[PDB]
């Protein structure tokens, strides 16, 4: 794999006027989808991680905001990074986004980690724009390779046995961490159950126990659900994304949970800001926020 060349061409459009693309060779990308896929299957499905690192929420193809993130927090391995799914769809440059991440993953597999989102799934990114982007710029079979790569993504992580990181949130079927480790890869996302709720569920201010999710999929949960889950597993914080927030960060249940969103002006239909939780080795968490004019 001629990796340093690929990463170089991906960062060549930094400073250019936004909207300019990066088109890699069809083979080069397919190499990323295989080399990264192997690294995923080697590392645990439940990532045991050590601070210090930076955690970023949804990107959703917004590639120039992602470049603004690294330009702010430092290009790897200057910092470590954890990403919470939703790399593709909605944005115009999903291919530039996902490739630069998968390249860094292969580049520094012990200091760069990508978690699965509800859009890293064929049935979803078929609808919202990653499929039309692959068919246009390349072909269909490349999308199927992407799918085979997405299936083997890791699901959740735990930063020093205290912070719990998943895309969506909690599941009623999750009572022990071994239920996560026993999940096999490759895997599609089933419409119901544990794996589905980890990428689709949402924190609800209005309900206390569990409730029906307006997405038509998974469940909501309340401030009571967060207090019991952190206590039973001896955890202090739950970190997730999956939902847009005004400041880029937004606490829940007396700072027990935080929602991260790293895409400013989410698909040109919001005034929102992008944020990024910088955690030093002592598990002290302060945010870095992106914002337009």
């Amino acid at each position: 794999l001629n990796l340093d060349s690929i990463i170089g061409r991906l960062l060549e459009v930094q400073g250019s006027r936004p909207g300019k693309n990066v088109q890699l060779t069809e083979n080069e990308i397919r190499g990323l989808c295989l080399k990264s896929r192997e690294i995923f299957l080697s590392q645990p499905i439940l990532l045991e991680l050590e601070a210090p690192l930076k955690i970023c929420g949804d990107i959703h193809g917004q590639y120039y905001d992602l470049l603004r993130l690294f330009e702010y927090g430092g290009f790897p391995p200057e910092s470590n990074y954890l990403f919470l799914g939703d790399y593709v769809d909605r944005g115009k440059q999903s291919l530039e986004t996902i490739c630069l991440l998968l390249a860094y993953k292969i580049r520094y597999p012990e200091n760069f980690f990508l978690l699965r989102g509800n859009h890293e799934c064929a049935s979803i990114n078929r609808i919202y724009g990653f499929y039309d982007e692959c068919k246009r710029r390349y072909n269909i079979k490349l999308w199927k390779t992407f799918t085979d790569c997405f299936n083997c993504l890791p699901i959740a992580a735990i930063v020093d046995e205290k912070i719990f990181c998943c895309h969506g949130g909690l599941s009623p079927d999750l009572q022990s961490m071994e239920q996560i480790r026993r999940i096999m890869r490759p895997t599609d996302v089933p419409d119901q159950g544990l794996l589905c709720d980890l990428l689709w569920s949402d924190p609800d201010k209005d309900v206390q126990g569990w409730g029906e999710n307006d997405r038509g999929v998974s469940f909501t949960f309340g401030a009571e659900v967060v207090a019991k889950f952190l206590h039973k597993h001896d955890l202090d914080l739950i970190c997730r994304a999956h939902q847009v927030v005004e400041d880029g960060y937004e606490f829940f249940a007396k700072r027990q949970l935080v929602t991260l969103f790293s895409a400013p002006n989410y698909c040109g239909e919001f005034d929102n800001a992008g944020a990024m939780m910088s955690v030093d080795e002592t598990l002290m968490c302060s945010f870095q926020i992106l914002k337009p004019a």
Partner: peptide, 19 residues
Amino acid sequence: VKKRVSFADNQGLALTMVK
């Protein structure tokens, strides 16, 4: 042996970096 999660805002330092 086991560290704890402490916010910078909670511990007397600014929470937010603007750019």
